[PDB]
Amino acid sequence: SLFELGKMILQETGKNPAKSYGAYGCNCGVLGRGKPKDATDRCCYVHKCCYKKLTGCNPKKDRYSYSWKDKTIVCGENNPCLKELCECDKAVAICLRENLGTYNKLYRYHLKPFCKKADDC
Amino acid sequence: SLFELGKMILQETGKNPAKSYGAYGCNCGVLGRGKPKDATDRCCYVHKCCYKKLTGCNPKKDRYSYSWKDKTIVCGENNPCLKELCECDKAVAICLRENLGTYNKLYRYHLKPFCKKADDC
Numbered sequence: 140s141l142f143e144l145g146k147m148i149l150q151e152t153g154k155n156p157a158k159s160y161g162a163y164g165c166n167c168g169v170l171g172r173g174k175p176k177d178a179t180d181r182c183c184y185v186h187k188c189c190y191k192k193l194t195g196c197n198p199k200k201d202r203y204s205y206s207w208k209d210k211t212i213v214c215g216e217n218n219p220c221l222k223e224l225c226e227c228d229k230a231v232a233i234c235l236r237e238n239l240g241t242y243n244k245l246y247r248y249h250l251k252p253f254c255k256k257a258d259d260c
Numbered sequence: 261s262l263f264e265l266g267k268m269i270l271q272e273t274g275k276n277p278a279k280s281y282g283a284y285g286c287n288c289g290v291l292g293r294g295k296p297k298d299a300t301d302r303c304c305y306v307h308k309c310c311y312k313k314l315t316g317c318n319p320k321k322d323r324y325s326y327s328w329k330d331k332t333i334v335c336g337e338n339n340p341c342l343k344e345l346c347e348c349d350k351a352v353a354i355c356l357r358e359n360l361g362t363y364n365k366l367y368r369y370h371l372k373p374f375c376k377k378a379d380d381c
């Protein structure tokens with residue numbers, strides 16, 4: 140769920156996830172996907188496509204178990220859908236941290252309704 | 261949908277809705293409800309309660325028509341679900357504006373995991 144996803148982004152990036160990524164670019168936060176603005180935005184595009192393919196569980200609300208071990212996110216077995224979800228969320232937290240160097244505050248709180256249309260996943 | 265909601269908040273408040281209201285208090289933005297921290301937060305609590313009566317339309321995804329007449333939000337006769345949805349969004353936009361006087365930036369990007377459990381609507 141968003142609880143686990145936001146915790147992971149905090150553990151990986153050291154950043155408040157809502158402030159930094161609740162509405163960044165065309166793909167981070169609410170409101171679907173759009174052509175990515177930059178590498179950080181592209182992380183969130185891949186993440187939304189990761190969710191789109193999952194079936195059997197709800198990426199928004201379903202909770203799941205994960206551990207922080209040796210400063211690594213380790214997804215608990217859970218059940219297969221929840222483990223795939225934990226893996227989508229892990230991957231985005233890692234991707235966002237990797238791309239902090241080009242994060243651009245201009246795209247924060249971005250105007251999404253003006254975003255170009257996204258290619259299909 | 262979130263597009264119409266965001267636009268109404270912008271028109272009423274003159275604030276960027278993602279920045280001011282995307283993660284405010286225990287009730288504004290993602291997740292559910294919780295005990296409200298202040299008046300602005302309580303507007304969002306009322307709004308989430310409003311959405312729970314909706315039958316036959318998705319408050320997040322479903323578009324509907326409204327217009328800005330004499331600096332007033334005017335819901336279009338949509339069908340019954342969408343008109344109610346439009347009325348819910350209008351009311352929260354007005355309430356947020358009416359309570360800008362006590363808006364506290366400290367509640368922005370709040371820790372919503374520790375919010376106390378909401379009372380029944």
Ligand SMILES: O=C(/C=C/c1ccc(O)c(O)c1)O[C@H](Cc1ccc(O)c(O)c1)C(=O)O
Nearest residue numbers: 141142143145146149150151152153154373
């Ligand atoms: O563990 C953390 C954060 C650890 C952390 C805090 C600040 C940092 O910069 C950092 O890299 C890691 O917060 C959790 C609480 C929490 C925060 C965000 C959430 O979405 C959540 O579900 C739980 C805790 O107290 O264990």
